[PDB]
Amino acid sequence: DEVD
Amino acid sequence: DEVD
Amino acid sequence: SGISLDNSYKMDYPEMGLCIIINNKNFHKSTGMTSRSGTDVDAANLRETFRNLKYEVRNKNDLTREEIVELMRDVSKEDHSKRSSFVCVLLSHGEEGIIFGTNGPVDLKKITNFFRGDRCRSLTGKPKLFIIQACRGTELDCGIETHKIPVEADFLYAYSTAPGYYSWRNSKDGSWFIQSLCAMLKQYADKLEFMHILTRVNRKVATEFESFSFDATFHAKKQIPCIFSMLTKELYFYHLH
Amino acid sequence: SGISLDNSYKMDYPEMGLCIIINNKNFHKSTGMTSRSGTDVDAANLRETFRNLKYEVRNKNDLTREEIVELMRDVSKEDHSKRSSFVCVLLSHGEEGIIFGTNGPVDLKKITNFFRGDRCRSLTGKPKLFIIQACRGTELDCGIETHKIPVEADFLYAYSTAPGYYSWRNSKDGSWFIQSLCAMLKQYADKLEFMHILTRVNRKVATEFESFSFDATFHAKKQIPCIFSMLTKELYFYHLH
Ligand SMILES: [Cl-]
Ligand SMILES: [Cl-]
């Protein structure tokens, strides 16, 4: 999970 | 007619 | 029992819920904000409309920013366990993200934060509807001829106008948006899901209203409302036996 | 003929319309923006999903801010007379009101203005859908345990996340929102009106996803998408005949  |  | 579906909010709690109407007509002289002629027509129409949907309506008039915050806080601390939903209607001056108390502005985020899923537990999982008749800026639309849930989930913001735009209020008839909203709820609340009702409101405002002004800057202007849905289920104001 | 209703957009033009997918994965080193692992999964899923809805899909990869603006302008100057609708999907970094080209930001207002009712006449009165997988700020949702029309009318912004919040992308599976959107379109596009599809997307993202991180600041976080509708009619991807 990564943020944009 | 009037604006808020 | 037989197969079950859960695509729609449970709206058969003992109570539909509160409908808080904040009707700001007269502003402190020092703010320089004009009186909002026509807003009492809106507040009366809303009271009757939500009464017929079986909401417990509370009308409040000419609240300061401090009174708005205290009212919202207190309401968020009530026990809503027996209530299906929550409705707040804001009638005032505004800008983007802001509505005005009689003496100055209130951040909309401050108001709505009281009802977050983690801060008002008796409304967690229930629809929280904020209906906002207020300007969102100064643009004019000149038209064209033709485990856990998120704390921001289950909110709906029914904005009278697009982000950045003025919103139009008629001094005799009430605001274009509130007029149209009440008319569509009266006609369709026993028939249509709420997003479809609000879409009919969008069409009514977009097609049936155009400003008339002796000032060319403000003449012949149009409006489109804005539905801002973070709901997770369909919302019907009726329920089945 | 018999009585007629017109509460739904006409979607039986010869063509459904364009679906422009802008897939920005790799950014210029000088911007400092990380590579968006997982976005190719999203772009492929979207291409297949909208192909099956009979859209003319155009995939574009790693566009500069200048290329994004030129592409949108050129597309808005095409003759859309035979097309029912227009779809644009933006996959990139972002912040509130902004999408990133590979070398810097693009104002979302600049992109969407090309398609205003008065500026793209062959799309006037037709639905213009902007689907945006991008951050809108840096907030994290901690969750809780359980005869004229307006120029801004007929736009729909299907935002992956609430205003002000980060949006979550899985490097293996794709973004939570795009994953969920394609799944719900595949299952329901022949059955449900578009707002009801997007409401199922809201519920899927809100209930089935939670972040996992070795960093406590970013761990166990939740997301709710945001439907921003200025549509004036119901939107079904199918038609009767
Ligand atoms: Cl009045
Ligand atoms: Cl990838």
Which structural domain range is residue C19 located in? 1-241
Q: From start to end of chain D, where are the E strands? A: 18-23, 56-61, 86-91, 94-95, 98-101, 104-107, 128-133, 144-145, 148-149, 155-159, 168-170, 174-175, 226-229
d(CA C100, CA C39): 14
DSSP category for residue C8 = B
- Residue D171's closest chain A neighbor by CA? A1
CA distance C137 to C160: 12
Q: What's the number of CA atoms in the CB half-sphere (13 Å) around residue D32? A: 0
Distances (CA, A) of C104 to C28, C30, C39, C50, C176: 9, 10, 18, 28, 25
Tell me D11's DSSP state: -
Phi, psi of D68 (to 5 degrees): -60, -45
Burial per residue of D140-174, b for 16 or more beta-carbon CB atoms within 10 angstroms, e otherwise: bbebbeeebbbbbbbbbbbbbbbbebbbbbbeeeb
State the distance between the two ends of chain B, measured CA to CA, in whole angstroms.
10
| Helix, strand or coil, per DSSP, at residue D153 | coil
Please answer yes or no on whether D212 and A2 come within 8 Å at the CB atom: no
Q: Which CATH number is C46's domain given? A: 3.40.50.1460
List D99's β-bridge partners, or say none: D94, D106
Cβ proximity of C118 and C151 under 8 Å: yes
- Min Cα distance B2 → chain C (Å) is 5
Distance (Å, whole) CA C31 – CA C24? 13
- Two tokens, residue C200: 């009919």
Ligand 2 centroid vs D64 CA: distance in angstroms?
18
Which residues of A touch chain D, with CB atoms under 8 Å apart? Answer: 1-4
Locate tokens 């079986």: which residue?
C54
Tell me the CA–centroid distance for residue D83 and ligand 2, in Å: 31
Q: CA D169, CA C148: separation in Å to the nearest integer?
A: 19
Resolution of the coordinates in A?
1.5
Q: Do A4 and D94 touch (CB under 8 A)?
A: yes
Cβ-defined contact of C144 to D234 (cutoff 8 Å): no
CB-CB contact of D227 with D198 (8 Å): yes
Domain count for chain D: 1
How is chain D split among helix, strand and coil, in percent rounded to 5?
A: 30, 25, 45
CB C175, CB C94: distance < 8 Å: no
CA dist D24 and D104 (Å) reads 11
Q: Do A3 and D218 touch (CB under 8 A)?
A: yes
Protein residues with C-beta less than 5 angstroms from the ion ligand 2: D 40
DSSP string covering D165-223, please? B--EEETTTEEHHHHHHHHHHHHHTTTS-HHHHHHHHHHHHHHH-----SSGGGTT-B-
This structure was determined by X-ray
Euclidean distance between CA atoms C61 and C51, whole angstroms = 18
